[PDB]
């Protein structure tokens, strides 16, 4: 049946086997096969064993070619052949992999049929040049009001989700992945960001739930997951964001705009880690390879919005960095702070608060900020920020006889933490981001109680989409708050607070 | 199994071809692989233990590591200057630097080339780099006075000559 | 003709075999051709056996061991020329600004040995700045380093742009910003910005010369970068007489590049994760940094810390060829001044009573004890009350706040961005300035008087203004 | 330097004999010479094997190589040279491994293809002949290089057969194919 | 359908260990003789291509 198709595909292979160079493993210890042969082998070059194993050729010595296997060394022993396939790492790119689980090498891990994809495009390629980008004024909408207003991001840039372990890290990325199904399914294809989700290190049963999850809102169609299990090789895993950044090029080439969301580099540093080890390469500080730094640099700067001359698209990217201790002064974090535009670094006390998103306001910053801002929200949330700097200094003023400002500041405070809250895994839409936070500059959410200002907002949107849908549509739009907009937001809003 | 200095192949290939290269390896020494400040000459069999020896690029050293069959000399001098299998003659003598009465208001380098050019060092000798430390029977204590002109460092800091006093 | 077949490939560190006595020496560049057009490589040992060790700048991916390498003969020689003044050139010396191939005079090697004892400089010289803040609390000496601190964007870079507009007017000199492990969208922004601002006009003239050293570039060519520059600056200053100021960027990002390629000699880096070689490589940058007879390069440079550490041995080596440190406060910013630099943080070791003229040391010291007791006086002040000061404090705290005012003082680049074109100020009248200011002349004139205005002829102009 | 780079450790001593005997162009005496003591060390087997271990002296070792230019005095001089080096550099271990490589290298610089065609079975000198001939035919021989070609059995190979020489093979196995098999057959 | 695609999975593994012992018949069988003739035949007419 079945069968009787892979019995004609193996009929279909009987290919000339004349192997211009061979290889002979002279000793395999450690997954650092030396071999006898090679000649003319191009350095990373993929090589195919006896055994079957993939390889990549780190060293060249003069007298061994110490291949890295990507293999499993079980089936590997001295003297193995060692096929020189003669072609540097390549996976498919192209818009074959939306809605695609697949390893490095392209395989499908999900078996969603083989990958079919416009190309197979090398993994590691140089960074765009300074006249090849063109600057970011792009915003990009992750659904979570606070990292739209707070940290407004933009396209083609570079900026970090740092924060502590198993906060559900992966949680807060999650999000903004499906506030952009929103988005996808508008025509614009600057509006269609094609995620890629870099799952590095991370279980195959967790995956299979994040995989579920995607399923359950319908996401796999835009998304792509590039996946590095646990169990994934450390060649794998260290060349998992070059491969997926290769796909990413399809897209950013095409003129079209993706975000890659590097899950998480910490992982990808214990890969390299061990590869260097291995090849007995001196480890850098922190016991983290020297040239860890020029790694992940050559990586993150591929992120990036290209010139209009070169079509004005982007690979936008979001970085994931564990921090074992909250330590943003671990010698990763340190590195990779620098290197990027922009953190964000989730408060793990917030968290355990329960206040979820958990976000640091004062440890997050973007560089690009609110050049990537909706000017409806801009407008509306110059004001948020200042507020929230009083509510810093005012919630030690929680410790009370106060000032009747400081204590204004710190009941308008209050309902405006537990207002940029949102439960996990259930984005917004920008039409109803931009009203609610007008309601609290304009202090009507300060009298409505904290704990009415839930059945608030819910009601309130449902008001407002029953009042004016109309307004809220054209806020949608225009994109702009205009005084008359503003007048009649501050109407309704008083009309709903009677109610 | 090992790796001797003998067996670069060039130097093999003169043991091969006979016997090596006429007793030139006793006084002068070809310069074998260099590069990190330090040199590997073959030769120079007749090297005192920290001679100074003049490398054909004008660089001198100091050899430090005498070793079977080579030695490690210390280049005093950039590497740029100084190239493989260079022809090293021996100065003959241990690192000296001249010592004198006129280096009174010189400036000199550490080998002692006068780096304000106020010509050349009108130095009595050369005397050697190192020169141990008088020891209890040539000592004497100390009773003259240095004054610094700074109170503190000369009511609560007496010194006087001869002495070893550090300022930290 | 010297050419070798790649012996080994492992990571960056190419080893060359050269046919017997046809060997080259240390420092030279190797061109290997190759469809990448070229990889040079600079020799950095001899392994003997004919054999050499080199490290690579272009990326040495795909490399194919035996290929036959060139041998140049020396290092890297790099265009340089009036010419070269508005290109943003790599490593190897080659147009990245994409305007084609760099109009170019002659060329020269990229390292180059400090100028002898004789031709350092034998007497102090202080460089014409024109941000008062800097001419009084840290003025600019010719062949110094001055060592930034503070954030970027608002705060250093249009600082840097200021300091090529003053240059220019100070000397008609130029300058080379070369940008260490610089994220190539915030250059592109900055070259994009520095065309905007005019100070590279290719429309027009371009003083400051761009070579930026994108992280993504190898760790040899970020390493490589700082020596091509200096010998840009060196051609001007030598060779055209000029006097220039020469941006650097991070050098810790100089510091880091320099680590690694050590690392990978096998080179035992020494505590803190830094290269054995530390000392020398910023010995032989930083003494080319100097007044020459013919010329004098003054660089400012950018010193980023790693984790606010002073005591990590780079950066102790940084202060220690520092002459100056400008440390630019946002609360400064804050304040309505821009310039953004924080006086009572921002020192200079040439400062000096004679250094400066007497007259200017101690109106400065007065200044000093100013604003130092105006800020300690601030604090218990606010607290207890306004009225709380005495007639004497209150006289100080009058004339403080007019001295806080009189810093702000546009910069000509930020005539666009703050809106008000520049006031420049020239170093002997910022002294007269504030003279009068503790005379209290203008202690009679108000406080935002003095608020965005430059010297003592402007803050006539605007006591007049304000009132009027 | 001499043709056929080698890039043996301890093979270096070859290399260098190859070079330095090539220069005074006694190559040919070379390696008939070293056939011959090599021959000798063939038939000294006791003490010429079983004192190959390393305990000798410096004065032991050179009495060892007396006694062995005492049993045959056909020796390139150059070689005698060498006898020396390896005596002094205690090199003993390695030393029928020089005396191959220089036979490798000297063979490579006269010419001569090795090769052999490992195999389930032992195949045919009609096969053998064959495949020689076929292998002459292809333009694999280019002349200058001769051949050696030396079916083996070997269990291993299972399926096909498989031709190796000039570092060129055309690999026949089963295994492959049953991989192939497999996999899909699972998925 | 769920047991449908398990069994359909489950066949291709039951046949699959059949398969093995087809592999052990053609490699006891002097059909590993007659195709070895084929395979010496086929690289010595491919090769010679080379």
């Not at chain 1, 739209?148 to 924060?163: F, M, N, S, T």
């Not at chain 1, 909706?374 to 919630?395: C, D, I, M, N």
């Amino acid at each position: 049946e079945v069968s009787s198709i892979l019995e004609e595909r193996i009929k279909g292979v009987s290919d000339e086997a004349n192997l211009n160079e061979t290889g002979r493993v002279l000793a395999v210890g450690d997954g650092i096969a030396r071999v006898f042969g090679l000649n003319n082998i191009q350095a990373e070059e993929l090589v195919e064993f006896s055994s079957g194993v993939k390889g990549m050729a780190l060293n060249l010595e003069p007298g061994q070619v110490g291949i890295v296997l990507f293999g499993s060394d079980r089936l590997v022993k001295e003297g193995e052949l060692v096929k020189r396939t003669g072609n540097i790492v390549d996976v498919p790119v192209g818009p074959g992999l939306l809605g695609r689980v697949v390893d490095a090498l392209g395989n499908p891990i999900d078996g969603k049929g083989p990958i079919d994809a416009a190309g197979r495009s090398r993994a590691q390629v140089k960074a765009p040049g300074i006249l090849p980008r063109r600057s970011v004024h792009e915003p990009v909408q992750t659904g979570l009001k606070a990292v739209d207003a707070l940290v407004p991001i933009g396209r083609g840039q570079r900026e970090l989700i740092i924060g502590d372990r198993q906060t559900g890290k992966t949680a807060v990325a999650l999000d903004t992945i499906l506030n952009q199904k929103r988005w996808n399914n508008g025509s614009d294809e600057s509006k269609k960001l094609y995620c890629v989700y870099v799952a590095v290190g991370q279980k195959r049963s967790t995956v299979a739930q994040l995989v579920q999850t995607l399923e359950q809102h319908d996401a796999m169609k835009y998304s792509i997951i590039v996946a590095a299990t646990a169990s994934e090789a450390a060649p794998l895993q260290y060349l998992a964001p070059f491969t997926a950044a290769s796909i990413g090029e399809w897209f950013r080439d095409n003129g079209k705009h993706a975000l890659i969301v590097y899950d998480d580099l910490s992982k990808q540093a214990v890969a390299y880690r061990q590869l260097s080890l291995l090849l007995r390469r001196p480890p850098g500080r922190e016991a983290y390879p020297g040239d860890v730094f020029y790694l992940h640099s050559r990586l993150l700067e591929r992120a990036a919005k290209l010139s209009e001359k070169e079509g004005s698209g982007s690979l936008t990217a979001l970085p994931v960095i564990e921090t074992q201790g909250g330590d943003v002064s671990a010698y990763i974090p340190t590195n990779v702070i620098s290197i990027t535009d922009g953190q964000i670094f989730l408060e793990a006390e917030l968290f355990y608060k329960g206040i979820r998103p958990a976000i640091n306001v004062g440890l997050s910053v973007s560089r690009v900020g609110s050049a990537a801002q909706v000017k409806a929200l801009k407008q509306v949330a110059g004001s948020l920020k200042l507020f929230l700097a009083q509510y810093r200094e005012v919630a030690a003023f929680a410790q009370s006889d106060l000032d009747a400002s400081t204590k204004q500041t710190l009941v308008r405070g209050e309902r405006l933490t537990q207002l940029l809250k949102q439960n996990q895994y259930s984005p917004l839409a920008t039409e109803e981001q931009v009203p609610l936070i007008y309601a609290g500059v304009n202090g009507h959410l300060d009298g409505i109680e904290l704990s009415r200002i839930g059945e608030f907002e819910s009601s309130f949107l449902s008001y407002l989409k029953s009042n004016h849908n109309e307004l809220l549509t054209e806020i949608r739009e225009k994109g702009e708050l205009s005084k008359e907009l503003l007048a009649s937001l501050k109407s309704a809003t008083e009309s709903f607070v009677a109610t | 199994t090992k790796a001797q200095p003998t067996e670069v192949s060039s130097i093999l290939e003169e043991r091969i071809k006979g016997v090596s290269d006429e007793a030139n390896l006793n006084e002068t020494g070809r310069v074998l692989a260099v590069g990190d400040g330090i040199a590997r000459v073959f030769g120079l069999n007749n090297i005192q233990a920290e001679e100074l020896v003049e490398f054909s690029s004008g660089v001198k050293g100091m050899a430090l590591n005498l070793e079977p069959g080579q030695v490690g000399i210390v280049l005093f001098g950039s590497d740029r200057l100084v190239k493989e299998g260079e022809l090293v003659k021996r100065t003959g003598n241990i690192v000296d630097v001249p010592v004198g009465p006129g280096l009174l208001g010189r400036v000199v380098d550490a080998l002692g080339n006068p780096i304000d050019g106020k010509g050349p060092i009108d130095a009595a000798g050369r005397s050697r780099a190192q020169v141990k430390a008088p020891g209890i029977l040539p000592r004497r204590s100390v009773h003259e006075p240095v004054q610094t002109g700074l109170k503190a460092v000369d009511a609560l800091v007496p010194i006087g000559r001869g002495q070893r006093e550090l300022i930290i | 003709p010297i050419t070798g077949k790649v012996t080994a490939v492992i990571g960056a560190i190419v080893d060359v075999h050269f046919e017997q006595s046809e060997l080259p020496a240390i420092l030279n560049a190797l061109e290997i051709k190759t469809p990448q057009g070229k990889l040079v490589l600079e020799v950095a040992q001899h392994l003997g056996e004919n054999t050499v060790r080199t490290i690579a700048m272009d990326g040495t991916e795909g490399l194919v061991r035996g290929e036959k390498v060139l041998d140049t003969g020396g290092p890297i020689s790099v265009p340089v020329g009036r010419e070269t003044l508005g290109r943003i050139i790599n490593v190897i010396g080659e147009p990245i600004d994409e305007r084609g191939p760099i109009k170019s005079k002659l060329r020269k090697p990229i390292h180059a040995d400090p100028p002898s004892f004789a031709e350092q400089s034998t007497s102090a010289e202080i460089l014409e700045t024109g941000i008062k803040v800097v001419d009084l609390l840290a003025p600019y000496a010719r062949g110094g380093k001055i060592g930034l601190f503070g954030g970027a964007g608002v705060g250093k870079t249009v600082f840097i742009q200021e300091l090529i507009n003053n240059i220019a007017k100070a000397h008609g000199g130029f300058s080379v910003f070369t940008g260490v492990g610089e994220r190539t969208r915030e250059g592109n922004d900055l070259y994009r910005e520095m065309k905007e601002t005019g100070v590279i006009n290719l429309e027009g003239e371009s003083k400051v010369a761009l070579v930026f050293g994108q992280m993504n570039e190898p760790p040899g060519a970020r390493a490589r970068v700082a020596l091509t520059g200096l010998t840009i600056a060196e051609y001007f200053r030598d060779e055209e007489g000029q006097d220039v100021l020469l941006f650097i960027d991070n050098i810790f990002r100089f510091t880091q590049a320099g680590s690694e390629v050590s690392a990978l000699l096998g080179r035992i880096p020494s505590a803190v994760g830094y290269q054995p070689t530390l000392a020398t490589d910023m010995g032989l940058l930083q003494e080319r940094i100097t007044t020459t007879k013919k010329g004098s390069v003054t660089s400012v440079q950018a010193v980023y810390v790693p984790a606010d550490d002073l005591t990590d041995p780079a950066p102790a080596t940084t202060f220690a060829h520092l002459d100056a440190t400008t440390v630019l406060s946002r609360g400064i910013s804050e304040l309505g001044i821009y310039p953004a630099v924080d006086p009572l943080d921002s020192k200079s070791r040439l400062l000096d009573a004679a250094v400066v003229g007497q007259e200017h040391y101690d109106v400065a010291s007065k200044v000093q004890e100013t604003l130092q007791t105006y800020k300690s006086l601030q604090d218990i002040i606010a607290i207890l009350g306004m009225d709380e000061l005495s007639e004497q404090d209150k006289l100080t705290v009058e004339r403080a706040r007019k001295i806080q005012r009189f810093l702000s003082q546009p910069f000509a680049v930020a005539e666009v961005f703050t809106g008000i074109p520049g006031k420049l100020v020239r170093l002997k009248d910022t002294v007269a300035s504030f003279k009068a200011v503790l005379e209290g002349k203008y202690d009679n004139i108000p406080e935002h008087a003095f608020y965005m205005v430059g010297g003592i002829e402007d803050v006539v102009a605007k006591a007049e203004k304000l009132a009027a | 330097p001499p043709p056929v780079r080698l890039f043996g450790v301890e093979g270096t001593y070859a290399t260098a004999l190859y070079q330095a005997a090539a220069k005074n162009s006694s190559i040919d005496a070379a390696f008939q010479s070293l056939q011959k003591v090599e021959s000798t060390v063939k038939k000294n087997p006791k003490l010429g094997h079983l004192l190959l271990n390393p305990a000798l002296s410096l004065k032991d070792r050179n009495s060892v190589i007396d006694a062995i230019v005492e049993t045959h005095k056909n020796l390139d001089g150059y070689v005698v040279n060498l006898l020396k080096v390896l005596s002094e550099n205690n090199r003993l271990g390695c030393f029928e491994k020089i005396a191959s490589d220089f036979g490798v290298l000297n063979d490579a610089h006269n010419g001569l293809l090795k090769g052999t065609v490992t195999s389930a079975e032992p195949l045919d000198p009609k096969s053998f002949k064959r495949i020689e001939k076929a292998l002459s035919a292809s333009k694999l021989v280019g002349q200058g290089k001769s051949l050696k070609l030396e079916n083996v059995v070997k269990p291993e190979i299972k399926g096909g057969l498989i031709v190796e020489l000039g570092d060129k093979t055309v690999d026949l196995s089963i295994s492959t194919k049953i991989q192939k098999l497999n996999k899909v057959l699972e998925d | 359908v769920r047991y449908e695609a398990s069994l359909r999975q489950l066949e291709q593994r039951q046949l699959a260990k059949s398969v093995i012992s087809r592999v052990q018949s053609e490699l006891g069988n002097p059909k590993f003789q007659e195709k070895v003739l084929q395979q010496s035949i086929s690289e010595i007419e491919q090769l010679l291509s080379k």
